[PDB]
Design a protein around this motif. Structure first.
Motif, PDB file in Angstrom:
ATOM      1  N   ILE A 186       7.463  -1.689  -4.028  1.00 20.85           N
ATOM      2  CA  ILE A 186       6.101  -1.541  -3.526  1.00 20.85           C
ATOM      3  C   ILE A 186       5.117  -1.362  -4.676  1.00 20.85           C
ATOM      4  O   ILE A 186       4.052  -1.987  -4.691  1.00 20.85           O
ATOM      5  CB  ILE A 186       6.033  -0.385  -2.522  1.00 20.85           C
ATOM      6  CG1 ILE A 186       6.919  -0.683  -1.327  1.00 20.85           C
ATOM      7  CG2 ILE A 186       4.625  -0.180  -2.041  1.00 20.85           C
ATOM      8  CD1 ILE A 186       7.310   0.538  -0.578  1.00 20.85           C
ATOM      9  N   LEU A 187       5.472  -0.561  -5.685  1.00 23.58           N
ATOM     10  CA  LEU A 187       4.571  -0.292  -6.787  1.00 23.58           C
ATOM     11  C   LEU A 187       4.409  -1.474  -7.715  1.00 23.58           C
ATOM     12  O   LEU A 187       3.463  -1.499  -8.501  1.00 23.58           O
ATOM     13  CB  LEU A 187       5.063   0.909  -7.585  1.00 23.58           C
ATOM     14  CG  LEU A 187       4.556   2.270  -7.128  1.00 23.58           C
ATOM     15  CD1 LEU A 187       4.936   3.369  -8.084  1.00 23.58           C
ATOM     16  CD2 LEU A 187       3.066   2.222  -7.002  1.00 23.58           C
ATOM     17  N   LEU A 188       5.305  -2.449  -7.658  1.00 22.83           N
ATOM     18  CA  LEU A 188       5.083  -3.665  -8.426  1.00 22.83           C
ATOM     19  C   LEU A 188       4.391  -4.749  -7.622  1.00 22.83           C
ATOM     20  O   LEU A 188       3.726  -5.606  -8.206  1.00 22.83           O
ATOM     21  CB  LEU A 188       6.400  -4.216  -8.947  1.00 22.83           C
ATOM     22  CG  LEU A 188       6.653  -3.875 -10.395  1.00 22.83           C
ATOM     23  CD1 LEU A 188       8.062  -4.231 -10.745  1.00 22.83           C
ATOM     24  CD2 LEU A 188       5.693  -4.631 -11.242  1.00 22.83           C
ATOM     25  N   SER A 189       4.529  -4.740  -6.298  1.00 18.95           N
ATOM     26  CA  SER A 189       3.925  -5.816  -5.527  1.00 18.95           C
ATOM     27  C   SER A 189       2.507  -5.507  -5.062  1.00 18.95           C
ATOM     28  O   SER A 189       1.626  -6.368  -5.141  1.00 18.95           O
ATOM     29  CB  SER A 189       4.787  -6.128  -4.307  1.00 18.95           C
ATOM     30  OG  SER A 189       4.573  -5.172  -3.287  1.00 18.95           O
ATOM     31  N   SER A 190       2.258  -4.301  -4.578  1.00 19.73           N
ATOM     32  CA  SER A 190       1.156  -4.086  -3.654  1.00 19.73           C
ATOM     33  C   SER A 190       0.231  -2.972  -4.117  1.00 19.73           C
ATOM     34  O   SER A 190      -0.089  -2.057  -3.361  1.00 19.73           O
ATOM     35  CB  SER A 190       1.719  -3.790  -2.285  1.00 19.73           C
ATOM     36  OG  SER A 190       2.778  -4.677  -2.003  1.00 19.73           O
ATOM     37  N   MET A 191      -0.212  -3.029  -5.349  1.00 13.87           N
ATOM     38  CA  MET A 191      -1.181  -2.006  -5.704  1.00 13.87           C
ATOM     39  C   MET A 191      -2.567  -2.601  -5.870  1.00 13.87           C
ATOM     40  O   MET A 191      -2.702  -3.737  -6.330  1.00 13.87           O
ATOM     41  CB  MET A 191      -0.776  -1.303  -6.996  1.00 13.87           C
ATOM     42  CG  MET A 191       0.465  -0.493  -6.826  1.00 13.87           C
ATOM     43  SD  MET A 191       0.289   0.538  -5.380  1.00 13.87           S
ATOM     44  CE  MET A 191      -0.939   1.682  -5.971  1.00 13.87           C
ATOM     45  N   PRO A 192      -3.622  -1.876  -5.496  1.00 18.59           N
ATOM     46  CA  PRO A 192      -4.978  -2.409  -5.656  1.00 18.59           C
ATOM     47  C   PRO A 192      -5.522  -2.118  -7.048  1.00 18.59           C
ATOM     48  O   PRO A 192      -5.458  -0.990  -7.537  1.00 18.59           O
ATOM     49  CB  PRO A 192      -5.777  -1.669  -4.579  1.00 18.59           C
ATOM     50  CG  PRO A 192      -5.053  -0.399  -4.383  1.00 18.59           C
ATOM     51  CD  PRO A 192      -3.603  -0.634  -4.707  1.00 18.59           C
ATOM     52  N   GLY A 193      -6.051  -3.152  -7.689  1.00 20.12           N
ATOM     53  CA  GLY A 193      -6.691  -2.991  -8.980  1.00 20.12           C
ATOM     54  C   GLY A 193      -7.749  -4.054  -9.165  1.00 20.12           C
ATOM     55  O   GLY A 193      -7.638  -5.170  -8.654  1.00 20.12           O
ATOM     56  N   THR A 221       2.328   5.889   1.374  1.00 19.89           N
ATOM     57  CA  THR A 221       1.660   5.610   2.640  1.00 19.89           C
ATOM     58  C   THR A 221       1.951   4.196   3.124  1.00 19.89           C
ATOM     59  O   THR A 221       2.081   3.972   4.335  1.00 19.89           O
ATOM     60  CB  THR A 221       0.159   5.809   2.519  1.00 19.89           C
ATOM     61  OG1 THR A 221      -0.324   5.047   1.411  1.00 19.89           O
ATOM     62  CG2 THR A 221      -0.171   7.269   2.334  1.00 19.89           C
ATOM     63  N   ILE A 222       2.059   3.243   2.192  1.00 18.84           N
ATOM     64  CA  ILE A 222       2.414   1.869   2.549  1.00 18.84           C
ATOM     65  C   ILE A 222       3.806   1.819   3.161  1.00 18.84           C
ATOM     66  O   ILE A 222       4.017   1.198   4.207  1.00 18.84           O
ATOM     67  CB  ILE A 222       2.304   0.958   1.315  1.00 18.84           C
ATOM     68  CG1 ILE A 222       0.842   0.663   1.001  1.00 18.84           C
ATOM     69  CG2 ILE A 222       3.044  -0.337   1.531  1.00 18.84           C
ATOM     70  CD1 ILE A 222       0.640  -0.163  -0.243  1.00 18.84           C
ATOM     71  N   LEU A 223       4.754   2.533   2.558  1.00 17.74           N
ATOM     72  CA  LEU A 223       6.120   2.542   3.080  1.00 17.74           C
ATOM     73  C   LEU A 223       6.205   3.240   4.432  1.00 17.74           C
ATOM     74  O   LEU A 223       6.908   2.766   5.334  1.00 17.74           O
ATOM     75  CB  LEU A 223       7.059   3.207   2.076  1.00 17.74           C
ATOM     76  CG  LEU A 223       8.545   3.021   2.338  1.00 17.74           C
ATOM     77  CD1 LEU A 223       8.858   1.581   2.672  1.00 17.74           C
ATOM     78  CD2 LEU A 223       9.341   3.460   1.130  1.00 17.74           C
ATOM     79  N   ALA A 224       5.472   4.340   4.610  1.00 16.58           N
ATOM     80  CA  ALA A 224       5.515   5.052   5.888  1.00 16.58           C
ATOM     81  C   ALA A 224       4.867   4.249   7.006  1.00 16.58           C
ATOM     82  O   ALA A 224       5.404   4.175   8.121  1.00 16.58           O
ATOM     83  CB  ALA A 224       4.834   6.413   5.749  1.00 16.58           C
ATOM     84  N   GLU A 225       3.730   3.617   6.730  1.00 14.77           N
ATOM     85  CA  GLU A 225       3.099   2.814   7.763  1.00 14.77           C
ATOM     86  C   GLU A 225       3.843   1.515   8.021  1.00 14.77           C
ATOM     87  O   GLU A 225       3.688   0.938   9.097  1.00 14.77           O
ATOM     88  CB  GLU A 225       1.646   2.534   7.396  1.00 14.77           C
ATOM     89  CG  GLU A 225       0.736   3.749   7.528  1.00 14.77           C
ATOM     90  CD  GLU A 225       0.323   4.033   8.960  1.00 14.77           C
ATOM     91  OE1 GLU A 225      -0.155   5.153   9.233  1.00 14.77           O
ATOM     92  OE2 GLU A 225       0.467   3.140   9.820  1.00 14.77           O
ATOM     93  N   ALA A 228       6.018  14.241   2.789  1.00  9.54           N
ATOM     94  CA  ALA A 228       5.344  15.238   1.970  1.00  9.54           C
ATOM     95  C   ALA A 228       4.044  14.730   1.348  1.00  9.54           C
ATOM     96  O   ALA A 228       2.965  15.227   1.680  1.00  9.54           O
ATOM     97  CB  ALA A 228       6.283  15.724   0.864  1.00  9.54           C
ATOM     98  N   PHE A 229       4.133  13.752   0.457  1.00 10.66           N
ATOM     99  CA  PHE A 229       2.981  13.333  -0.344  1.00 10.66           C
ATOM    100  C   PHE A 229       2.353  12.045   0.198  1.00 10.66           C
ATOM    101  O   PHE A 229       2.286  11.016  -0.473  1.00 10.66           O
ATOM    102  CB  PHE A 229       3.385  13.190  -1.813  1.00 10.66           C
ATOM    103  CG  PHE A 229       4.767  12.629  -2.023  1.00 10.66           C
ATOM    104  CD1 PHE A 229       4.976  11.262  -2.056  1.00 10.66           C
ATOM    105  CD2 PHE A 229       5.848  13.469  -2.216  1.00 10.66           C
ATOM    106  CE1 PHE A 229       6.229  10.750  -2.257  1.00 10.66           C
ATOM    107  CE2 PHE A 229       7.104  12.957  -2.420  1.00 10.66           C
ATOM    108  CZ  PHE A 229       7.295  11.593  -2.441  1.00 10.66           C
ATOM    109  N   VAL A 230       1.844  12.118   1.423  1.00 11.66           N
ATOM    110  CA  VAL A 230       1.091  11.004   1.977  1.00 11.66           C
ATOM    111  C   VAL A 230      -0.338  11.463   2.236  1.00 11.66           C
ATOM    112  O   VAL A 230      -0.674  12.628   2.023  1.00 11.66           O
ATOM    113  CB  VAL A 230       1.734  10.461   3.264  1.00 11.66           C
ATOM    114  CG1 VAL A 230       3.159  10.050   2.996  1.00 11.66           C
ATOM    115  CG2 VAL A 230       1.670  11.500   4.365  1.00 11.66           C
ATOM    116  N   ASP A 231      -1.182  10.549   2.695  1.00 10.54           N
ATOM    117  CA  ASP A 231      -2.569  10.877   2.987  1.00 10.54           C
ATOM    118  C   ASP A 231      -2.766  11.164   4.470  1.00 10.54           C
ATOM    119  O   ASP A 231      -3.805  10.833   5.045  1.00 10.54           O
ATOM    120  CB  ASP A 231      -3.488   9.743   2.542  1.00 10.54           C
ATOM    121  CG  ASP A 231      -3.236   9.329   1.113  1.00 10.54           C
ATOM    122  OD1 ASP A 231      -2.637  10.128   0.367  1.00 10.54           O
ATOM    123  OD2 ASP A 231      -3.638   8.213   0.736  1.00 10.54           O
TER     124      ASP A 231
END
Lengths: 99, 80, 50, 230, 50, 99, 208, 50, 50, 13
Positions: free
Chosen positions: D41-48, D217-221, J10-13
């Protein structure tokens, strides 16, 4: 090429795609249009005071629709010697041969 | 003789676009396939046609250079 | 060519690996022991096949 | 169910860009799962934010050349594609670079606004050689994710823009390199716990705890589709 | 003879895509098949993808 | 304290500007006063719409000049300067005044 | 003089303004004058280029023009040669630093003003007005206008008694404020006199 | 001399590094060869052949 | 910056102890993320008694 | 899925 044979230099010079300096010396470097080389006095003729102005061939058509383009690889106010390269042609990197 | 004019026929407000008011592609641009570069069509060839050299199918690009040593007359009233 | 190398590395054996000589109740837990990290892909084993 | 929950305990900054981060405590076996998922996720989907349209004055196409400079215009567009910008409020800003005189043109010469921050004050762009030469480019900085290139953005753009604006490819992702390690945790009563040492390498523009929070948050949603519906 | 002589020089910029041909210096030809993302690449323990 | 007087004809635009200004303030400094709406000037105009004669024939136009009073209580080093590079959208006359 | 101007009634809602700046009572008239000048100049220049809408926008003692035109190529000419030329003259007209942008008009058959201009041109070069009108209407319809109306008036076919004729197609609701009604006008200065061309193009309704 | 130059840099002498997989996060068995080959793009491009 | 949520389109129930959760569509390189995460949790972390 | 969601709760928004 990180693993070359050292014959890259001779091929990239001897094929006339790079702008090898005719007379050594310093540089004035207008260069947007042409490299301007001030000539050291030993290689410089008595008459014809003379500074060498090299024409860079920018983006143009090759015979195989590729792009032959020359880019200056020397900065402003930098010594160059006779036989040294000044502008890197297509597929060259500081006078070597980068296919 | 054939003619170099933008006043391209049958084809509508999809001819006069990457060109000037006197014809020919206006340089630079993000031209692709099916565009018009040099309006070059004759009358008597309600009997007009479209020989206007266009861009080949599948290619894109940027017009980097336009050379013209044309029939002593290519000019409109004055670019020449 | 690639697939016969994958099979020849898969169905082979070595004289000691993870899970040498353990006993397995089916091929499903053979793949489960390979994936979880408790045996090796070539480790000789009594299984029960049908 | 005797599980636990992890927290970001220590966040050390080795530099402004390269910075590690711990995670503690993880359950047995969860370390490689969370590490590989957060890596993907941290390599594919970060906003910059990145450079999208460059507008130089007295230019026709990107394959021309200019008066008084070293790098050619394709070299300038590549060196601008490497730029690292960090806006705060807006999502689309326009900067300005104006400079004359003999010497190199750093990234620190851009006449910044208030909410844009250029985090690389030694990023070279041009090498102005003539003292009578000038250069006045107007950059446009959007904000997105992934990789959107010039060909697809040749017709995608809806807002009819005028002709003369050079299109630069958009490398939006500010994460370049990420590695995780599953050590042995130092828990005073448990020996079967582990820590996750994520070693990020950013573009300087992203804050690592913010990046980890957004990836979580991306993984949880994404997993809520498994949780709620069946 | 020739009257209207207009030559127009396009310049396509072709990137790389599934189907091109790459090769080393030793005779190892190849048609580049899949253009993977950065994440799916085999990374060593230092973190750099290949 | 820095008083800021935003003036514009479009209200939405003005609002947008105000928000932006607030954002600019709030990151750098601290305790932004707030976006206080003053009274709008509705400058009306009547005109005869006939070329020659018809006096009861009329159009009544107006220009709604909106006012937004933003104040900044603590001017820091970083904050005040931030506005120099931070120009606002066109058609919005701003008017900063410290003290 | 029955009808309200379709652009003018909608400026607050669905249509935007052309000149987009703020100024106090002091400098406003002057600004307006400047706008009038520059616009006039532009019209004069880019007659052969199909130009629909000049949008002037002046922030911080510097004028930003935005020319909406169907063919940028003829307005731009060679890359940054004609535009640049235009700019300095614009600046001169204004008395401030100028900046010209050029928006490319997608579908010039759906732009009303452009259509009107075309019609006028046709009239000038002695076509059957009716056939021109038909063409205008048809083309717009083809392009995907929800509706179009065009009207031409006065000395039609050089006739002594002037009259007006008009062709509608689709729906063109004028009382409906939320309708995107691109209205515009033009004038054919023929041998027999002026022929005024109005055209309404209904793009569709906006929901907000 | 290749081995000795690989010892001047801090790289493993065999030329082979253990590599993980970007998909599964788990190690490839039997360490693989990573290095830098000078690869060329030949002018047989696929959108001149399609 | 908005992500694609999927719909669970199918539970082809082959037997009472069999399923096939067809699931579409996800972002590019997210199917492997969800699948591998669920697979490792279901293999080596799911509670139960035997 | 709820095991992993409660693990990451834990560490979500």
């Amino acid at each position: 090429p990180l693993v070359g044979t050292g014959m890259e230099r001779a091929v990239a010079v001897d094929s006339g795609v790079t702008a090898v300096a005719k007379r050594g010396g310093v540089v004035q470097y207008v260069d947007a249009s042409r490299i301007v080389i001030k000539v050291n006095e030993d290689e410089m003729y008595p008459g014809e005071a003379g500074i060498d102005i090299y024409n860079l061939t920018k983006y143009t058509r090759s015979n195989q629709n590729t792009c032959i383009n020359q880019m200056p690889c020397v900065s402003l106010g930098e010594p160059v010697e006779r036989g040294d390269v000044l502008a890197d042609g297509p597929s060259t990197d500081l006078g070597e041969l980068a296919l | 003789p054939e003619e170099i004019t933008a006043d391209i026929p049958n084809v509508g407000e999809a001819a006069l676009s990457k060109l000037d008011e006197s014809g020919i592609v206006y340089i630079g641009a993000e031209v692709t396939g099916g565009d018009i570069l040099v309006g070059k069509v004759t009358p008597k060839g309600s009997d007009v046609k479209d020989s206007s050299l266009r861009v080949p199918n599948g290619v894109s690009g940027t017009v980097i250079d336009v050379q013209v040593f044309t029939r002593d007359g290519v000019e409109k009233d004055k670019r020449a | 060519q690639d697939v016969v190398l994958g099979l020849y590395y898969m169905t082979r054996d070595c004289v000691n690996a993870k899970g040498e000589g353990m006993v397995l109740t089916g091929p499903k837990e053979a793949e489960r022991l390979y994936r979880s990290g408790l045996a090796s892909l070539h480790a000789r084993v009594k299984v029960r096949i049908t | 169910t005797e599980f636990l929950k992890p927290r970001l305990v220590d966040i050390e900054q080795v530099s402004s860009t390269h910075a590690k981060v711990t995670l503690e405590p993880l359950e047995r076996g969860f370390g490689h799962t969370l590490g590989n998922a957060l890596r993907r996720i941290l390599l594919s989907s970060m906003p910059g934010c990145a450079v999208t349209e460059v507008e130089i004055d007295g230019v026709l196409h990107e394959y021309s050349t200019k008066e008084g400079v070293q790098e050619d215009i394709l070299e300038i567009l590549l060196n601008l594609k490497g730029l690292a910008v960090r806006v705060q409020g807006k999502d689309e800003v326009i900067l300005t670079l104006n400079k004359s005189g003999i010497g190199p043109v750093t990234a620190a010469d851009i006449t910044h606004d208030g909410d844009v921050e250029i985090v690389k004050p030694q990023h070279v762009i041009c090498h102005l050689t003539d003292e009578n030469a000038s250069i006045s480019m107007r950059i446009k900085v959007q904000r997105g994710r992934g990789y959107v290139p010039a060909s697809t953005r040749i017709h995608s753009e809806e807002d009819e823009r005028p002709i003369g604006r050079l299109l630069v490819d958009a490398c939006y992702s500010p994460v370049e390199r990420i590695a995780y390690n599953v050590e042995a945790a130092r828990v005073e009563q448990r020996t079967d716990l582990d820590k996750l040492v994520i070693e990020m390498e950013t573009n300087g523009t992203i804050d690592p705890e913010e990046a980890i929070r957004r990836a979580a948050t991306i993984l949880a949603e994404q997993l809520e589709a498994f949780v709620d519906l069946r | 003879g020739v009257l209207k002589i207009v030559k127009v020089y396009l310049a396509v910029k072709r990137r790389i895509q599934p189907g091109d041909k790459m090769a080393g210096r030793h005779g190892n030809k190849g048609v580049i098949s899949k253009i993977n993302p950065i994440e799916d690449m085999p990374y060593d323990e230092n973190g750099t993808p290949v | 304290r820095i008083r800021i007087r935003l003036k514009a004809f479009d209200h939405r635009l003005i609002d947008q500007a105000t928000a932006e200004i607030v954002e600019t303030a709030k990151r750098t400094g601290a305790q932004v006063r707030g976006p206080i709406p003053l009274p709008t000037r509705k400058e009306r105009f009547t005109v005869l719409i006939s070329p020659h004669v018809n006096k009861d024939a009329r159009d009544q136009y107006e220009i709604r000049t909106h006012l937004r009073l933003v104040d900044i209580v603590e001017p820091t080093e970083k904050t005040v300067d931030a506005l120099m590079r931070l120009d606002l959208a066109a058609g919005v006359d701003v008017q900063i005044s410290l003290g | 003089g029955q009808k309200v101007h379709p652009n003018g009634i909608r400026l607050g809602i669905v249509k935007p303004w052309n000149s987009t700046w703020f100024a106090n009572t002091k400098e406003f008239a002057d600004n307006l004058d400047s706008d009038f000048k520059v616009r006039q100049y532009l019209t004069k220049e880019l007659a052969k280029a199909s130009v629909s809408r000049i949008v002037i926008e002046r922030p911080a003692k510097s004028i930003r023009v935005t020319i909406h035109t169907a063919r940028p190529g003829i307005v731009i000419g060679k890359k940054g040669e004609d535009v640049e030329k235009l700019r300095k003259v614009v600046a001169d007209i204004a008395g401030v630093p100028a900046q010209i942008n050029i928006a490319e008009v997608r579908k010039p058959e759906l732009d009303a003003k452009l259509v009107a201009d075309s019609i006028t041109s046709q009239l000038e070069r002695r076509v059957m007005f009716r056939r021109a009108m038909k063409r205008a209407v048809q083309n717009a319809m083809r392009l995907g206008a929800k509706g179009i109306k065009v009207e031409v008036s006065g000395r039609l076919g050089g006739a002594e008694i002037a009259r007006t004729e008009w062709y509608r197609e689709g729906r063109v609701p004028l009382h409906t404020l939320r309708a995107d009604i691109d209205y515009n006008t033009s004038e054919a200065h023929t041998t027999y006199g002026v022929i005024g061309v109005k055209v309404w193009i209904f793009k569709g309704e906006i929901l907000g | 001399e290749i081995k000795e130059l690989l010892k001047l840099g801090d790289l493993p002498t065999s030329g082979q590094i253990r590599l993980y997989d970007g998909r599964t996060g788990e190690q490839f068995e039997r360490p693989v060869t990573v290095g830098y080959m000078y690869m060329l793009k030949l002018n047989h491009l696929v959108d001149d052949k399609m």
